[PDB]
Amino acid sequence: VDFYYLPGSSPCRSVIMTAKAVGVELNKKLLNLQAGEHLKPEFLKINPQHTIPTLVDNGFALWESRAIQVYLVEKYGKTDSLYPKCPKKRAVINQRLYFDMGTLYQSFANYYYPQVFAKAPADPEAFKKIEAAFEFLNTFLEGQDYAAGDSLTVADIALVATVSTFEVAKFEISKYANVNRWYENAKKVTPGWEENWAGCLEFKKYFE
Amino acid sequence: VDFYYLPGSSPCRSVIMTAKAVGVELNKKLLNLQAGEHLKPEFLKINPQHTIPTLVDNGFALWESRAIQVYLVEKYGKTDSLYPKCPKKRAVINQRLYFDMGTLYQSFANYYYPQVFAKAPADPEAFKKIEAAFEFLNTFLEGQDYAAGDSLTVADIALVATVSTFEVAKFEISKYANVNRWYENAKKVTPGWEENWAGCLEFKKYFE
Numbered sequence: 001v002d003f004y005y006l007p008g009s010s011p012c013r014s015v016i017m018t019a020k021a022v023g024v025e026l027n028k029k030l031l032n033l034q035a036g037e038h039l040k041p042e043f044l045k046i047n048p049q050h051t052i053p054t055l056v057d058n059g060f061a062l063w064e065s066r067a068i069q070v071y072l073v074e075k076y077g078k079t080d081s082l083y084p085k086c087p088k089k090r091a092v093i094n095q096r097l098y099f100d101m102g103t104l105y106q107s108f109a110n111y112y113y114p115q116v117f118a119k120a121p122a123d124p125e126a127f128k129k130i131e132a133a134f135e136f137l138n139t140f141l142e143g144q145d146y147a148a149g150d151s152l153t154v155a156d157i158a159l160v161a162t163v164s165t166f167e168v169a170k171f172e173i174s175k176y177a178n179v180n181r182w183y184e185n186a187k188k189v190t191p192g193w194e195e196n197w198a199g200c201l202e203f204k205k206y207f208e
Numbered sequence: 209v210d211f212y213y214l215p216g217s218s219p220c221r222s223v224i225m226t227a228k229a230v231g232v233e234l235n236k237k238l239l240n241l242q243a244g245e246h247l248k249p250e251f252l253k254i255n256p257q258h259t260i261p262t263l264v265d266n267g268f269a270l271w272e273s274r275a276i277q278v279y280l281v282e283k284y285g286k287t288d289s290l291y292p293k294c295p296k297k298r299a300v301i302n303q304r305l306y307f308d309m310g311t312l313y314q315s316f317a318n319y320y321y322p323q324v325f326a327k328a329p330a331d332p333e334a335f336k337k338i339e340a341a342f343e344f345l346n347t348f349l350e351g352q353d354y355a356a357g358d359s360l361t362v363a364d365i366a367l368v369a370t371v372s373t374f375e376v377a378k379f380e381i382s383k384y385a386n387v388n389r390w391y392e393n394a395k396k397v398t399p400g401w402e403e404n405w406a407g408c409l410e411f412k413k414y415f416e
């Protein structure tokens with residue numbers, strides 16, 4: 001199983017943690033985006049959208065971190081604990097994964113990307129959207145130890161990648177008591193957390 | 209099965225078309241966002257994120273259109289044709305669903321939302337991102353009749369909702385030959401297309 005990635009990338013880190021939780025060995029292949037390695041003809045043949053993470057599993061090329069997370073559990077999971085067979089349980093996890101992409105991580109990207117990639121002035125209005133996203137996550141987590149069911153699922157792992165990216169960006173996570181509680185527990189129980197944090201500290205370099 | 213929605217909403221229309229394809233009757237409940245009906249305590253108890261579409265199915269409250277699409281197929285589909293059992297086939301569909309949210313529809317939102325909701329001047333740079341997204345979709349569709357497998361799947365239905373929203377926004381879809389071919393076929397084969405187009409024409413009012 002080939003894994004094209006960079007350690008700093010949040011979506012790459014979600015896959016690293018998921019693969020570790022599942023117990024599937026990844027052949028880790030650094031793909032240097034700063035060098036344009038993703039844009040070379042050889043990579044475009046694998047992933048024409050030229051994004052990381054990209055997985056190649058026995059001829060099957062797959063991208064989108066959250067699709068990769070689910071695929072790894074479905075194909076390699078000894079049990080379905082991280083992504084249960086029940087359509088209802090799956091739907092909650094799926095909703096949280098779409099929340100993670102389209103609301104939570106989207107708020108990260110909308111606010112921090114223009115600053116770190118375009119060197120633009122921070123938009124205090126986009127910051128309000130981050131706060132809104134955390135407020136929703138906080139409400140989801142009321143009375144709940146995990147984000148999308150009774151135990152750890154791919155939804156938690158995805159959110160851990162995102163929230164840890166916010167931590168290294170110096171966002172005040174502690175203001176959201178349920179998020180903070182969930183997050184601190186998640187660090188202790190999520191396989192691959194240390195490698196994720198190494199990646200977060202790598203990404204921090206964009207804030208220097 | 210209760211369905212809180214507005215006909216103009218792209219994510220609502222994906223669910224309408226999916227429910228029709230599956231053959232599941234929806235109790236359609238208009239939720240007037242302009243009135244703030246989604247923000248009332250009674251709705252927040254169902255969906256604390258106050259978004260449409262929201263489904264309530266026998267006590268189970270679910271939001272995120274793409275999660276709802278999959279759930280309807282998993283629970284109600286007579287066959288799994290729209291969302292096959294195979295993890296590999298599912299993964300391709302899942303990747304296309306994340307593409308639809310985070311790349312294609314995101315480009316719509318980034319460009320048109322500030323104009324139609326904030327009355328801001330169009331950003332020609334955000335327009336370039338729409339073109340980029342369509343270029344990726346065009347490449348995905350090379351030699352393919354459907355977006356994510358040999359037959360129509362929830363991925364096509366999601367993309368139909370999005371691309372039809374671009375059509376009513378007057379985006380030049382015909383410039384992307386594979387997208388145009390796929391889209392025109394999709395109109396003919398996708399259950400609920402006419403109701404989707406009615407909704408698109410409703411949304412057009414935001415461009416008056």
Ligand SMILES: N[C@@H](CCC(=O)N[C@@H](CS)C(=O)NCC(=O)O)C(=O)O
Binds near residue numbers: 009011052063064
């Ligand atoms: N929605 C995608 C996002 C992928 C993504 O943001 N990858 C970035 C690096 S973190 C990338 O490959 N950028 C290079 C490019 O798009 O050309 C996912 O979750 O995997």
Ligand SMILES: N[C@@H](CCC(=O)N[C@@H](CS)C(=O)NCC(=O)O)C(=O)O
Binds near residue numbers: 217246260271273
């Ligand atoms: N990612 C969500 C998007 C939901 C969405 O954009 N809904 C809008 C209307 S089209 C909404 O409920 N806005 C009201 C709000 O967020 O307060 C999905 O696919 O369902």
